[PDB]
Amino acid sequence: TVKELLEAGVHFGHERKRWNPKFARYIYAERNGIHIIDLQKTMEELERTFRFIEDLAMRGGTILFVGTKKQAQDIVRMEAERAGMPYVNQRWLGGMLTNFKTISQRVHRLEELEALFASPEIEERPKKEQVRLKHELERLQKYLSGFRLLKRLPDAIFVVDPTKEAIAVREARKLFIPVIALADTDSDPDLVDYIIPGNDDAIRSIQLILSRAVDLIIQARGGVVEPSPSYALVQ
RNA sequence: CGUCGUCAGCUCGUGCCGUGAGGUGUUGGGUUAAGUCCCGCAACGAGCGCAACCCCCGCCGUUAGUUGCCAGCGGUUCGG
Numbered sequence A: 001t002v003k004e005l006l007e008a009g010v011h012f013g014h015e016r017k018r019w020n021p022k023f024a025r026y027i028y029a030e031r032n033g034i035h036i037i038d039l040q041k042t043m044e045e046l047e048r049t050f051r052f053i054e055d056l057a058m059r060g061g062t063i064l065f066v067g068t069k070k071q072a073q074d075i076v077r078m079e080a081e082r083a084g085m086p087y088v089n090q091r092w093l094g095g096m097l098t099n100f101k102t103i104s105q106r107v108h109r110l111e112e113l114e115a116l117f118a119s120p121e122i123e124e125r126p127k128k129e130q131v132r133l134k135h136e137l138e139r140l141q142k143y144l145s146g147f148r149l150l151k152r153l154p155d156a157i158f159v160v161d162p163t164k165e166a167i168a169v170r171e172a173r174k175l176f177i178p179v180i181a182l183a184d185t186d187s188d189p190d191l192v193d194y195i196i197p198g199n200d201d202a203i204r205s206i207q208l209i210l211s212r213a214v215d216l217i218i219q220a221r222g223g224v225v226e227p228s229p230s231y232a233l234v235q
Numbered sequence B: 001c002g003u004c005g006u007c008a009g010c011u012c013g014u015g016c017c018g019u020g021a022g023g024u025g026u027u028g029g030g031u032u033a034a035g036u037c038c039c040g041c042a043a044c045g046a047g048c049g050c051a052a053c054c055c056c057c058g059c060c061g062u063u064a065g066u067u068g069c070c071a072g073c074g075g076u077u078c079g080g
Ligand SMILES: [K+]
Pocket: none
């Protein structure tokens, strides 16, 4: 909540090409063939975005974090592994929201196989199944790791790159689910309800924004949590 | 019942795409006898198939000696 001057590395955008003209309002200028985000409008939108986040958090709402850019995977896997908001990390399966019932059936199979490997029924029905179901539970935990926490449809979603995760954005629009997103120059701002005009490539921007967001979430529900152990993931 | 044909296929549920017939899934890369499996993917699963569970032939054991053997000894019209 004090990220005014500590925003080191967020103003960096993508190149001159691969941009979206609809983002021109959130751009300050172009330095050395690279779009640089407007520093003022960044916090201008951050006010309203974080205010919506606090309102939805203190009401007890669930937010789905979505990240697949391979630069925010290890960060989302723990910033959402804090206060119990679910997440999707490896890839966004088509129909996680519109076909939410079938994916919940997949989650049922996940916890069923978890109950099988907890019961003494592991050894019966010989080793063929002990390998098949082992690999099946492996991949189910690989994909539905954070998604298993959703019992109903989420009240909002959080996206790291709305261009790379455009399918989740589209499904959220279809179901009238608010779309919080960390938008860059390559993204369409109209599809994002609450926009965060920052960098989606640099690890520091993602760590800063997501850490402060989860800190605001836990601050809305009381019991301020220690700083997130995602700094060591700078590497 | 024969046949394409023991051929590797044909579909469905939900979601998504298209005004619509339809598509996606079932395409792709690797692999297999196989839509067999792996990886990827607006798809996620499922059914009839494939395969397996059935029978026979292959090695061994347990249970049982009106089939078998000087394996073992005795008798032998010396033919278990
Ligand atoms: K058209």
